[model samples]
Target: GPHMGDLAKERAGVYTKLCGVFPPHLVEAVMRRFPQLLDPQQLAAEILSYKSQHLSE
Candidate 1:
């Protein structure tokens, strides 16, 4: 039953998890840094990079 829509649904699920774990500000930072980023994998990489550099005090 897998179709093109299935891939979209999976991607949507990733975005859901990404939003839940990563804060709005950090997500904004990733968005600002790489506006061309479409895949959640790249987004996660950038977010983790930022989180690593500017994590909690």
Candidate 2:
């Protein structure tokens, strides 16, 4: 097995930031929809925009 390293740390860091903007279920949905999206702040902004658009309808 591999030791905990930068990759693991960064992934956890990203998840922690995501939780700041999204609950667990919403985080899971975004991760599933955009696995390549590692920038939490940008992703959060995108999700907020998406949510606002739907809420306005």
Candidate 3:
């Protein structure tokens, strides 16, 4: 099985491509600036943050 990092990279690639269709410029900027922004840990954290922020309210 692939590790989290590997899985994240794969998922990120999909997201990047999807974003590229609508927001190509932002996607490019994200790829250039925080290349690892889509790491599994980061993605998990973001998901948790969203739940914490909205669910708690």
Candidate 4:
């Protein structure tokens, strides 16, 4: 499945190493910056295979 969008903006928010923690602002950053990651394939690849255990490691 090629689901290319978002993961429902929950109050819980999404976790990311780029900036630990998630507020509405953080979610917005992901939304806005996702496209500009400057490496669509790399970004998409990482996002697709993103792992919770290896986030900040």
Identify the leading candidate in terms of TM-score: 2
Ranking by TM-score: 2, 1, 3, 4
Candidate 4 overall lDDT versus native: 0.40
* Residue-wise C-alpha lDDT for candidate 4, range 1-57, written one tens digit per residue: 256344443212333432443343534444565543423234434444444534674
Name the regions of candidate 2 deviating beyond 4 angstroms: 1-9
Q: Mark the regions of model 3 whose C-alpha exceeds 4 Å error after superposition.
A: 1-36
CA lDDT, candidate 3, residue 29: 42
- What are the Cα lDDT values of the candidates? 0.65, 0.69, 0.49, 0.40
Stretches of candidate 4 off by over 4 Å are 1-21, 36-57
The predicted structure with the larger lDDT, 1 or 2, is: 2
Residue by residue across 1-57, what tens digits does model 2's lDDT show?
254455566657888888787787767766666555556776687678667877943
Instruction: State the lDDT of candidate 3 residue by residue for 1-57, as single tens digits.
Output: 433467565756656554544345444444444454544344444445544766743
Model 4 compared with the native: what TM-score? 0.23
Q: Rank the candidates by lDDT, best first.
A: 2, 1, 3, 4
TM-score of each: 0.51, 0.59, 0.33, 0.23
**Using lDDT as the measure, which candidate wins?**
2
- For residues 1-57, write the lDDT of model 1, one tens digit per residue: 433455556556656766866776766667667544435567778877777887787
Candidate 2 vs candidate 4: which has greater lDDT? 2
